Amino acid sequence: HRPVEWVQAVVSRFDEQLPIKTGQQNTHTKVSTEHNKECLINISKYKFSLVISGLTTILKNVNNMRIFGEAAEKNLYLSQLIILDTLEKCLAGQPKDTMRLDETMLVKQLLPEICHFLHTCREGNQHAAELRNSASGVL
Amino acid sequence: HSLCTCSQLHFSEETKQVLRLSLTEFSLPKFYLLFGISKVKSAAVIAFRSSYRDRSFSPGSYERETFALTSLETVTEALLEIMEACMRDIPTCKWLDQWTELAQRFAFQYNPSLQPRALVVFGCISKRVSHGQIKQIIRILSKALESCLKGPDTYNSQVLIEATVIALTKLQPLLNKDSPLHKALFWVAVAVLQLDEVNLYSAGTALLEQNLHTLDSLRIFNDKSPEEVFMAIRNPLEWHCKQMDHFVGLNFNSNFNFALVGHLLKGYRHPSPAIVARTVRILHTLLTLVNKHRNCDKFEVNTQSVAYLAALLTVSEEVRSRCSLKHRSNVLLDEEVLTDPKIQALLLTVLATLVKYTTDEFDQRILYEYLAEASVVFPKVFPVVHNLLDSKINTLLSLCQDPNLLNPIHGIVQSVVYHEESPPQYQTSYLQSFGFNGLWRFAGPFSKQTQIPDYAELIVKFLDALIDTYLPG
Amino acid sequence: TFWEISSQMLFYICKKLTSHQMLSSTEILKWLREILICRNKFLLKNKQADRSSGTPPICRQAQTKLEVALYMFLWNPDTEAVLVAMSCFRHLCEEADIRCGVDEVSVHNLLPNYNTFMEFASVSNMMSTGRAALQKRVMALLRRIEHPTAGNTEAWEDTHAKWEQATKLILNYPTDSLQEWINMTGFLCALGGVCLQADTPVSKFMDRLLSLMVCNHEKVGLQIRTNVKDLVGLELSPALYPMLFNKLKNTISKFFDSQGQVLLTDTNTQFVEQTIAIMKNLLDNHTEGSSEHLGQASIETMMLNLVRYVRVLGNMVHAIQIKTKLCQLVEVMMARRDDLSFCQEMKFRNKMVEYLTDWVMGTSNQAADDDVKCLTRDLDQASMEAVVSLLAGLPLQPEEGDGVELMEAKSQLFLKYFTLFMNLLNDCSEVEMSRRLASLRHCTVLAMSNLLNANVDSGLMHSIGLGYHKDLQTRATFMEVLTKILQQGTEFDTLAETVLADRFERLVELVTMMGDQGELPIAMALANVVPCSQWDELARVLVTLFDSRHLLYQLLWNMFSKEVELADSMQTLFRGNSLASKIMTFCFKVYGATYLQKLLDPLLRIVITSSDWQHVSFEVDPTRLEPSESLEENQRNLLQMTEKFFHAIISSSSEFPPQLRSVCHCLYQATCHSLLNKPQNSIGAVGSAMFLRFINPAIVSPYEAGILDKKPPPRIERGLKLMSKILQSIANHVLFTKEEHMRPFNDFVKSNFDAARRFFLDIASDCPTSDAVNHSLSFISDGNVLALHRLLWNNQEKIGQYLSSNRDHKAVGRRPFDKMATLLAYLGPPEHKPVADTHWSSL
Ligand SMILES: [Zn+2]
User: Fold this and answer.
1) How many CB pairs under 8 A join B and C?
2) Can you tell me the distance from the alpha carbon of B387 to that of B433, in angstroms, rounded to the nearest whole number?
3) A35 at interface of B, judged by CB pairs closer than 8 A
4) What is the CA angle B425-B429-B433, rounded to 5?
5) Nearest Cα to Cα of residue C692 among C571, C793, C602, C805
6) Among residues B48, B49, B167, C8, which one has the fewest Cβ atoms lying within 10 Å of its Cβ?
7) What is the 3-state secondary structure (H, E, C) of chain A?
8) Contact between A113 and A63 (Cβ < 8 Å)
9) How many CB atoms are located within 10 Å of the residue B320 CB?
10) CB C603 within 8 A of CB C648
11) A26 inside 8 A of chain B by CB
């Protein structure tokens, strides 16, 4: 009962430390905010379905976000970079359960958002280069 | 001063040195506070007024400080020190026997303005007490409680209780060496801690602490363990006792050591930093007695001696080092000896409770490291510690920014999910089944809305039976 | 090849860093750190397999530059750069251990400032804070570099040339540029002492420094002065006071023309106002090591000249505030009077009172008709506080400009001041601001009381009229004073021998309270609470007092045990500076002096003067070996001389003072107890320790110890030096390693290894409790007691707090804190100290 609500806190704290989201200087030299990731990665091994689904919505929200300015673009670029890198580690980290019954998330939630980057994405000559490189490893 | 400069009396040169030190002591800022004239540079000036012939005095500032019956003991024993020095020289003096008689007359007579002060003094000076006297004192406490709940005037009779307890703390070391009440005054102390008032709690420990010290000097714990002695004398009046345990939410038949510790844990919430160290000493003295019964080096871990080590964990360094967490001598939480489901459900509630109200970095660090390690070594019983840990961890996860304190909490979350996927064998209400449903409640802070918990209607009957059984007449 | 090349790389890179600032400098440093880590391991493993590890000149010529570049980064503006640089001192230290494991032989000889460097490490491991806060900690540690070194004396000079040139750019040109200038100055002040020792680089620093306090520069002039005042006061190295004062004095002396006429000038007035702020902060702060250096210089002549200039300044809102501050300086100068040095204390205190009474003028703000001059009220309030402090214990002495009977002169002098105070007292009456008058009136009576006590003979007659004064509060005070005057004896009269002896008899009992199981809470607590500045006074008093009580053994066991148990390096800390350490120094010096001189003296006559010895060189160095003298002759003579000294030391076991005998036993028990918790011999460490610190120093330089009036000839001096090395080796049972020069002598030491053990054991064999050895001298020790009571009164409150924290198990009513407050109040405030005719002197 409670522990499910404990995981939400670890996930929820993840959103509020994405650069595009107000930084609020909670990084505490990034040691505090980095530790949270390691927990989020570790929890996925036993609640894979829950964690992955939560991550997708965080990515989906970031995509449907409009911001203008040199600061604006840089924040979102670094924002999506962390999500993808974390997301790949969860997949790789997960033991070879080889459970092929994840269709629900893949068909609708996940594939459309990963596929979006693979397009040319000519917004940034240097940024889009990394996103495709990072996203492809996920796929 | 008149004593030091009197010719009728012939004090040797030894005595006169005692007096002169007393003369200096009374003029220190310590005694200005006791008399209640602190913030007064010199007493003489205030006592006299220059323009006392021309105009009448003009009092003001009706705001008036309070008095504490503990202050009266300190003064009342300073005077008693002076008087005895004199009686050494004066042969066949009658001073002390005349003063006692005056106190004994107001002590046992109803007067709500003089009775409390005449009890704190009757005991501090008296040299002999008989069974007939003790019964009256303990029956002034029984009527004091009854008035409190009946009427709306509380503070009036909340000092006649604190004064009865302070007297008993002084009159016991004079009792006969073979009297039952030497042991039945362990339940008076316990029945007073249950009233949830900072003064009543403070006075209750002082009776408890000396109750152990006296029984040792009588060599009563030589061949028996605390549980055996106090639980043997409670048997004749078990019927009234049983009902109290139901409402306070602790049981003494199920597990003695834990019930006794349960009450003392509230001491950690006392505003005065002098009552905090007194409850720690009472724990050591209890720890050194249970192990001595088993000849176990005073720091061995067993079923009996595990409750007092969780309480001493965060205050006593020798306890922490000699009982160390395995995943950094023997290590607390051993599953070889702590192989009983009950004896390991309670030991977790004590640890969870100590952090629910604590607010200190050094304490939260030490207590959580023992809770992570508990999460793994005791997977099955740990789900009985969620609601206690539920709220505070949830806040810590969101806002905490300390690597030292943020590590163990994460270890707790990971363990919970891992050992999930099974139908909970033990629910949160596992403790209410066998009595200790109130253990976490009894250690809360002292209520600002001072009121008798209203289950004092039973403490009266318990006391009444206690008199009837051991003081027939 | 590794050290040939790897070391040569460092020499190239380090020399680049020092030369000038580069953008990536803070990065090369992080890389330079790991190189040091990575060449310790190769030395560590290399030494393990085969010590044989070579140290060619390049290894030295490149070790220097590494240090010369690690100091100059401490004042670097970048916070990260300085923190990293501090951490790089460990790897400079840890290399010392590997090359030579034994601490004393090399760890304090190859790397003289070994102990301080370890402190840099701890400060680095702290939370980041602004450059100012960090600079405070850096400059503290930079001030404790005791030993001159090539790295120090060249880090100081190299950064001086940079400092000099940088200054010109700032001034000549008609914020980040300035901040660097501040950092270089502070560094170059805290670390001044090392380069100390006519025209010199250090001296030129001061002159330029003083020539900036008056720097009038429209652009940035204000900020320069605000910081030079701030540094020279709160940051100068205590090793430079004797030079600051002398230059500070000479600058003033030329403000006065011939015939002593002040030459007012606007800059001259700005210079004095600065010399007051510098002196006040300099004197106000009590720091470690400052006291010993205040003594050298004479601050009198500067102080007198300072007032005259302020005396003639005139009256105005500006000049009045200067008068105020100077008066407050004279108050602080009279709280340190015991530390300072005075050629003529009395003749100087009288003039100041003469010069200060003129400024206390009341009711001058009403005639002035301006409330803007209400400050003049503050000047009178400030002036009196100075006169109170000046007068406390001051006999009067009239200037002999005219010849009259001395007694007649004084009585006239006394009445001069008495009426002055009386007149100011009448005005302050409320009937004739309430807080101002209350304080001023209070002061004016305390000032009068101090005047009478010192001069009862010449001033009682003039003073009786205060009995019937018109102010009731004032009549009580005059009566209290005379109560003392009667109670104090007129002559010696053996009146303190009876009254004071009995009155203060109980005091020692409280201090000597035998805490259960040797706790001694008063002494132990008094140790920590007392500020480190007075550790000299505290050490002497405790040792002297306990000896009188025949309980010296008890104090040592308690004091040493905490230090030794706390730090397993028992021997190292004792030689270091600390309260426990200083106890040893007093013990050896006070009792050892007689023992050493009596023993060594007869031998010194033989070698120095006897014609039989004639002229011979006690040298075995082949490089210095003279062909004229045969090596065999020198070797045999030197060995023969050593036997003479060695035999005398062993024979004179009985003459050892009992005090040290007790001292050795406590250390023996401490190490023996230390061994138990941990084939090391306790005697071996004790014997080497005692010999190295007590016997060895006298032999090397007997003249400095005072054994010999005339300095021994250098040729005679060499034999003593080599003698010590041979003797010291015997204690450690160490043969000559890489010491072929003295290897032939290694044969001699073998026989005497057993003999040395017997001498050490005899002293170490004294009974732990001297039940048999008894000396019930029980001397009064009147002089010492007064200081002890004086010490307690000053720290009455703070020592209580330490007692309050502990002792909860038992009520303190029968324990020190209750006893202390009762007795201490009973005795009342201590009397003022008497003046010192002699110059300032120390142990
Ligand atoms: Zn001189």
Assistant:
1) 14
2) 17
3) yes
4) 95
5) C571
6) B48
7) CHHHHHHHHHHHHHHCCCCCCCCCCCCCCCHHHHHHHHHHHHHCCCCHHHHHHHHHHHHHHHHCCCCCCHHHHHHHHHHHHHHHHHHHHHHHHCCCCCCCCCHHHHHHHHHHHHHHHHCCCCCCCCHHHHHHHHHHHHC
8) yes
9) 17
10) yes
11) yes
Q: CB distance from A13 to chain B under 8 Å?
A: yes
Is C822 within 8 Å of B27 when comparing Cβ atoms?
A: no
DSSP 8-state secondary structure symbol assigned to residue C103:
I
Q: Which residues of C touch B30 (CB under 8 A)?
A: 821
Cα–Cα distance for residue pair C763/B332, rounded to 1 Å: 50
Residue B385: count other Cβ atoms within 10 Å of its Cβ: 21
DSSP code per residue over C132-146: HHHHHHHHHHHTT--
Question: Coil, strand or helix: which one is C199?
Answer: coil
Q: How many CB atoms lie within 10 A of CB B116?
A: 24
- CA B291 – CA C221 distance, rounded (Å): 77
Distance of CA B29 to the CA centre of its chain: 29
Q: In residues, how long is chain C? A: 843
Tokens 């990394």, residue located: A130
CA distance C724 to C700: 7
Q: How far is the CA of C839 from the centre of ligand 1 (A)?
A: 6
> Ligand 1 center to residue C344 CA distance, Å?
8
Determine the distance separating the centroid of ligand 1 and the alpha carbon of C342, expressed in angstroms: 7
Distance in angstroms (rounded) separating the CA atoms of residues B156 and B145: 11
Consecutive H or E run containing A136: helix A127-138
Measured between CB atoms, which of A3, A32, A42 is closest to B420?
Answer: A3
Residues 6+ apart with CB under 8 A from B408: B365, B368, B369, B371, B372
Distance from CA of B25 to the nearest CA of C (A): 6
Chains in contact with chain C (at least 3 beta-carbon pairs closer than 8 A)? B
Chain B neighbours among C 360-379 (CB < 8 Å)? none
Cβ-based neighbours of C389, under 8 Å, separated by 6 or more: C330, C331, C334, C335
CB-CB under 8 Å, C809 with B28: no
What is the rounded CA–CA span in Å between residue A47 and residue B413?
A: 12
Q: What percent of chain C is helix, strand and coil (3-state, nearest 5)?
A: 70, 0, 30
Closest residue in A to B389 (Cα–Cα)? A2
Most distant CA atoms of chain C, gap in Å? 100
Residues 6+ apart with CB under 8 A from B215: B182, B183, B221, B229
Neighbours of chain B (3+ CB pairs under 8 A): A, C
Among C456, C388, C374, C373, smallest CA distance to C421 is for C388
Which residues in chain A touch residue B402, judged by CB atoms under 8 angstroms apart?
A: 32
For residue C9, what are the contacts with CB-CB under 8 A and spacing of at least 6? none
Phi and psi dihedrals of C256, rounded to 5?
-105, 130
Q: How far, in Å, CA of C487 to CA of C490, rounded?
A: 9
Hey, are the CB atoms on C826 and B281 less than 8 Å from each other? no
Place of tokens 């090359």: C99
C337 C-alpha to ligand 1 centroid (Å):
15
Nearest 10 degrees: Cα torsion C304, C309, C311, C315: -160
For residue C632, what are the CA distances in angstroms to A130, B362, C281? Answer: 84, 71, 63
Q: Is A121 on the interface with B (CB under 8 A)?
A: no
> Rounded distance, CA B352 to CA B362, Å?
16
Q: Which residues pair with B56 in a beta bridge?
A: none
Residue C571 phi/psi, 5-degree rounding, is: -65, -40
User: Can you tell me whether residue C262 is helix, strand or coil?
Assistant: strand
| Chain position carrying tokens 């570790």 | A42
Number of neighbours of residue B73 by Cβ within 10 angstroms = 17
- C-alpha–C-alpha distance, residues B16 and B22, integer Å: 10
